[PDB]
Amino acid sequence: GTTPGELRELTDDELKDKLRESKEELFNLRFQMATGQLSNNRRLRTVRQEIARVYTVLRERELG
RNA sequence: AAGUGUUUAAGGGCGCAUGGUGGAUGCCUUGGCACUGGGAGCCGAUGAAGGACGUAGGAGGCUGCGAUAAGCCUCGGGGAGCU
Ligand SMILES: [Mg+2]
Ligand SMILES: [Mg+2]
After folding, report:
1. Any idea which UniProt keywords this protein has?
2. Among A19, A10, A29, CA closest to A53
């Protein structure tokens, strides 16, 4: 999705906004998929990327 | 008139040529056995060994993986092929 350095240089408020929005997008796209009106898959994996990145960066900033 | 006599195979046996079933024989090795020289001699409450269940675009199974589910990041090695 974005560069890990992109959201490293991006702020905590923007990153929480992004985590909100991207959880929403995971939700929405994953279950449009589950509705089975689609053809591809990698969207779930990309949102996996973004969730893991946000979670890791939040731990990092919260720990030090 | 007389006495003399092969002349057939329902089947069978023997050989010969053909085949049929059964898979030994010969040839092969990703498999095993036994060693040598090295490495490592533990794994676990930061939740182990081993399992249930799930995980794919596709129904099951094996392999990996774990609702973040044939996987995710960051760093380094390779490439025009991969899912
Ligand atoms: Mg399995
Ligand atoms: Mg490298």
Report:
1. Ribonucleoprotein, Ribosomal protein
2. A19
For the record, the structure tokens of A19 come out as 């985590």
Contact A50, A22 (CB under 8 A): yes
List of A residues 18-57 with CB within 7 A of strand B: 41, 44-45, 48-49, 51-53, 55-56
What dihedral angle (degrees, nearest 10) is formed by the CA atoms of A41, A43, A45, A49?
170
Closest CA to A45 of A26, A59, A28, A31: A26
What is the structure's resolution, reported in angstroms to one decimal?
2.5
Distances (CA, A) of A63 to A1, A36, A57: 25, 41, 10
Instruction: Look at chain A and count its residues.
Output: 64
Method: cryo-EM
